[PDB]
Amino acid sequence: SRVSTRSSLAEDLRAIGLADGDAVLVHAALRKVGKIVGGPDDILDAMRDVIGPAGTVLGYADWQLEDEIRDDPAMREHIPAFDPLRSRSIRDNGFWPELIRTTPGALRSASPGASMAAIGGEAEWFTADHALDYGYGPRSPLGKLVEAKGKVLMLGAPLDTMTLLAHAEHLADFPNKRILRYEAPILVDGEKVWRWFEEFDTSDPPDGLADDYFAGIVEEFLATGRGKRGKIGEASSVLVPADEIVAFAVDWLERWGRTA
Amino acid sequence: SRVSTRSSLAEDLRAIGLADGDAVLVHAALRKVGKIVGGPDDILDAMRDVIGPAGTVLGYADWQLEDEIRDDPAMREHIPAFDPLRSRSIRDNGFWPELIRTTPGALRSASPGASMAAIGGEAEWFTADHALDYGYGPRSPLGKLVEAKGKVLMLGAPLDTMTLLAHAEHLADFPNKRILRYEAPILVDGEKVWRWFEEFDTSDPPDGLADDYFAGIVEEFLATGRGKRGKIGEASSVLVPADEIVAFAVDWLERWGRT
Numbered sequence: 476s477r478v479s480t481r482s483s484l485a486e487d488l489r490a491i492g493l494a495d496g497d498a499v500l501v502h503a504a505l506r507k508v509g510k511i512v513g514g515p516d517d518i519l520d521a522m523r524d525v526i527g528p529a530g531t532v533l534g535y536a537d538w539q540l541e542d543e544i545r546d547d548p549a550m551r552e553h554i555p556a557f558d559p560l561r562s563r564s565i566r567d568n569g570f571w572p573e574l575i576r577t578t579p580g581a582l583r584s585a586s587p588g589a590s591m592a593a594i595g596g597e598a599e600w601f602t603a604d605h606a607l608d609y610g611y612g613p614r615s616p617l618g619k620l621v622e623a624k625g626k627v628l629m630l631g632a633p634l635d636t637m638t639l640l641a642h643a644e645h646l647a648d649f650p651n652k653r654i655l656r657y658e659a660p661i662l663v664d665g666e667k668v669w670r671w672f673e674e675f676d677t678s679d680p681p682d683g684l685a686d687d688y689f690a691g692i693v694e695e696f697l698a699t700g701r702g703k704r705g706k707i708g709e710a711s712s713v714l715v716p717a718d719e720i721v722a723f724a725v726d727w728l729e730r731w732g733r734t735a
Numbered sequence: 736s737r738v739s740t741r742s743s744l745a746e747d748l749r750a751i752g753l754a755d756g757d758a759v760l761v762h763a764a765l766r767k768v769g770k771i772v773g774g775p776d777d778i779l780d781a782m783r784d785v786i787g788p789a790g791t792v793l794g795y796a797d798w799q800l801e802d803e804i805r806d807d808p809a810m811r812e813h814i815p816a817f818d819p820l821r822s823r824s825i826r827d828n829g830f831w832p833e834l835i836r837t838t839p840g841a842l843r844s845a846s847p848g849a850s851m852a853a854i855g856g857e858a859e860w861f862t863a864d865h866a867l868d869y870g871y872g873p874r875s876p877l878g879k880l881v882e883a884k885g886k887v888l889m890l891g892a893p894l895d896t897m898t899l900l901a902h903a904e905h906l907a908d909f910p911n912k913r914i915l916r917y918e919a920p921i922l923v924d925g926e927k928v929w930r931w932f933e934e935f936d937t938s939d940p941p942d943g944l945a946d947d948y949f950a951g952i953v954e955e956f957l958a959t960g961r962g963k964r965g966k967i968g969e970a971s972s973v974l975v976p977a978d979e980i981v982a983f984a985v986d987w988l989e990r991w992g993r994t
C-alpha cells in the first residue's frame with residue numbers, strides 16, 4: 476500500500492500541470508486517492524501550496540433538498556431556506572465540496588442548485604453575484620472560471636460529472652433546450668421566502684443524448700492532445716483548461732443540433 | 736413513515752426534559768431518528784430553540800490521528816498538528832460532533848484526544864482552557880458540565896458512549912488507574928510542535944471491568960428513577976443530569992476498588 480503525503484500529493488499535482496495562480500474546479504472520488512497521512516485535507520493543503528495564496532480551489536456544493544420534499548405541500552412549512560453559510564453540500568457530490576466549504580476562509584455562492592464552494596485568493600470573486608435564475612450561465616462561478624482561464628481537475632471522479640460542461644449547454648445554440656422551472660425556499664435578508672426559479676435542465680440531457688454524454692466529450696477533448704492525464708495519489712486524474720473544453724463542447728453541441 | 740420536523744423535534748426534546756438555559760452533551764446515532772425534513776441540522780436547530788440562546792449544545796469531537804501513525808517515525812513529518820479550528824472530528828463518534836463543529840459560531844477546545852465541540856451562549860466558557868494533560872479532569876468541558884449542572888442526551892446512541900463517565904474515572908479514587916503517555920503534534924500559534932501527553936486510560940477499561948461497562952452503570956443509574964427515557968424522532972433516547980450521574984459513578988467505582 477502506497478501512502479500519500481502533502482509533499483507527495485503536491486508533486487503529483489505539479490506533474491499533472493498545476494501552477495502558481497491557477498483557479499481550479501475539482502470533482503473528486505476521494506477514496507480512489509488511497510491512503511493519505513493527514514486525511515483528504517492534505518489534498519486541499521497540497522493544492523494551495525502548488526497554486527499559492529493567489530490561486531483558488533473550487534468545489535460543486537449544491538444543496539440537499541430533495542425534489543419531492545420540495546414539491547410536496549405538507550413538507551413546505553418545515554423546509555429550511557437555503558443558507559449559503561449553513562446549508563450543507565449535496566452528498567451525491569462526495570465529501571470534497573463539504574471539505575472545502577467547512578474549511579475556514581472558504582466561501583459559497585447564492586444560487587442554491589448551482590452553488591459553488593471556493594477557497595483562496597479569488598474565492599470572493601468566484602462566489603459573488605451568482606445569478607439565481609440560470610445559475611450555469613455567464614454570471615456564475617463556472618462563467619468566471621472561463622474568464623479567468625481556470626482549470627478543471629477530475630480527481631479520480633467519473634468524467635461525466637464535469638459540471639463545467641453544463642455551462643456549455645447554457646451557451647450552446649441548439650434547438651429545443653429544456654427549460655426547467657421549480658420553486659425553492661431561500662433567505663431574503665434573513666427571512667425564508669419561497670421563490671420561483673428558471674434554468675436550463677441539468678438533471679437530464681438534451682433529448683437525443685445519454686445521461687453520461689459529458690464523458691464522451693471529455694474523452695474526445697483529451698483525444699486532441701489537449702489536457703493531461705496523471706496519477707494524484709493512486710487516483711487516475713485529468714486536468715483540462717476551462718476555456719478550451721467549453722469552446723470544444725459548445726461546438727460539439729452546436730454541431731449536433733445542426734443535424735438529423 | 737413519520738417524518739420529523741424542527742417543530743416536531745422541539746416537542747420530543749421538551750418531553751425528554753430539556754429546558755431554558757440548559758447545557759447538554761449529546762451523543763447521537765443520527766440514523767435511528769429516522770427521516771427528518773431539513774436533515775439532522777433540524778435536531779440542533781430544535782435543540783437551541785428549546786434551550787434558548789443562553790443554552791449550550793456540546794459534542795465529543797476528538798480527532799482523527801491513528802496511534803500507529805503517530806508512533807511511526809517515518810510518518811512523523813507528514814502528520815499535521817492538531818488545529819482546533821481545522822482538525823476534523825473523529826469519525827467513530829458519528830456525524831453529530833462535526834455537525835456542531837462546522838456550524839457557524841461553534842467552538843472547539845484545545846486538548847486533542849478529549850476535544851469537545853460547543854455552540855451556544857457559554858460555548859466559549861466550556862471550550863476555554865481545556866487541560867492538555869488529563870483532559871478528562873476538572874479542567875475540561877466535562878468538568879464544567881458538572882459545575883454548570885448540565886445534562887447528557889444519548890440520542891439513540893449506545894449507552895457505553897457516555898464519555899462523561901470517563902471523567903468519573905478521573906475523579907474516582909480506586910486501585911491501578913492505568914496511566915497513558917504518548918507524544919502528539921499540536922499547533923502552537925500556527926506552528927507544529929510535538930509534545931508528550933499524560934492521562935488516565937480512556938480507550939481501555941480498568942482491567943477487571945468489561946469494555947462495555949458504561950452501559951450497566953447508566954442502566955443502574957436509570958433504575959433509581961432519575962434521568963428520563965423517551966423518543967426523539969424515532970430514536971430511543973436517555974437524558975440524565977451530569978452532576979448526579981458523575982457523583983453516582985464515582986461512588987460506584989470507589990466501591991468496586993475497595994474489593
Ligand SMILES: CN[C@@H]1[C@@H](O)[C@@H](O[C@@H]2[C@@H](O)[C@H](O[C@H]3OC(CN)=CC[C@H]3N)[C@@H](NSCCNC(=O)CCNC(=O)[C@H](O)C(C)(C)COP(=O)(O)OP(=O)(O)OC[C@H]3O[C@@H](n4cnc5c(N)ncnc54)[C@H](O)[C@@H]3OP(=O)(O)O)C[C@H]2N)OC[C@]1(C)O
Binds near residue numbers: 588636677
Ligand atoms: C437541488 N439540487 C439538484 C439540482 O442542482 C439538479 O442537480 C443536477 C444533478 O442531478 C446532475 O446530476 C445528473 O447528471 C449526472 C451526470 N454525471 C449524474 C447524476 C445526475 N442526477 C448534475 N450533473 S453533475 C454531478 C456532479 N458530481 C460531482 O462533482 C461528484 C464527483 N464525484 C463522484 O462522482 C464520485 O464517484 C462519488 C460519487 C462522490 C464517489 O465518491 P467516493 O465513493 O469515491 O468517496 P467520497 O469522494 O465521497 O469520499 C470518500 C472518502 O472521504 C473521506 N471522508 C469523508 N468524510 C470524511 C471525514 N468526515 N473526515 C475525513 N475523511 C472523510 C473518507 O476517506 C472517505 O472514504 P471512506 O468513508 O473511509 O470509505 C448537475 C446538477 N445540477 O437536479 C437535481 C437536484 C437534486 O434538484
Ligand SMILES: CN[C@@H]1[C@@H](O)[C@@H](O[C@@H]2[C@@H](O)[C@H](O[C@H]3OC(CN)=CC[C@H]3N)[C@@H](NSCCNC(=O)CCNC(=O)[C@H](O)C(C)(C)COP(=O)(O)OP(=O)(O)OC[C@H]3O[C@@H](n4cnc5c(N)ncnc54)[C@H](O)[C@@H]3OP(=O)(O)O)C[C@H]2N)OC[C@]1(C)O
Binds near residue numbers: 762775798830895
Ligand atoms: C486520539 N483519539 C483516541 C483517544 O482519545 C482514545 O479514544 C477513546 C476511545 O477509544 C473510546 O472508545 C472506546 O471505548 C468505548 C466505550 N464503549 C467504545 C469504543 C472504544 N474504542 C472513547 N470512549 S467513548 C466513545 C464516544 N462515542 C460517541 O460519542 C459516538 C456515539 N454514537 C454511536 O455510538 C453510534 O452508534 C455510531 C457509532 C456513531 C453509529 O451511528 P449511525 O451510523 O447510526 O449514525 P451517525 O451518527 O453516524 O449519522 C449518520 C446519519 O446522519 C446524517 N448525516 C451524516 N452526514 C450527513 C451530512 N453530511 N449531511 C446530512 N446528513 C448527514 C445521515 O442521516 C446519516 O445516515 P445515512 O448516511 O443516510 O445512512 C473514549 C476515547 N477517548 O484512544 C483512541 C484514540 C484514537 O487514540
Ligand SMILES: [Cl-]
Ligand atoms: Cl501550513
Ligand SMILES: [Cl-]
Binds near residue numbers: 669
Ligand atoms: Cl408560504
Ligand SMILES: [Cl-]
Binds near residue numbers: 631632633712
Ligand atoms: Cl478518469
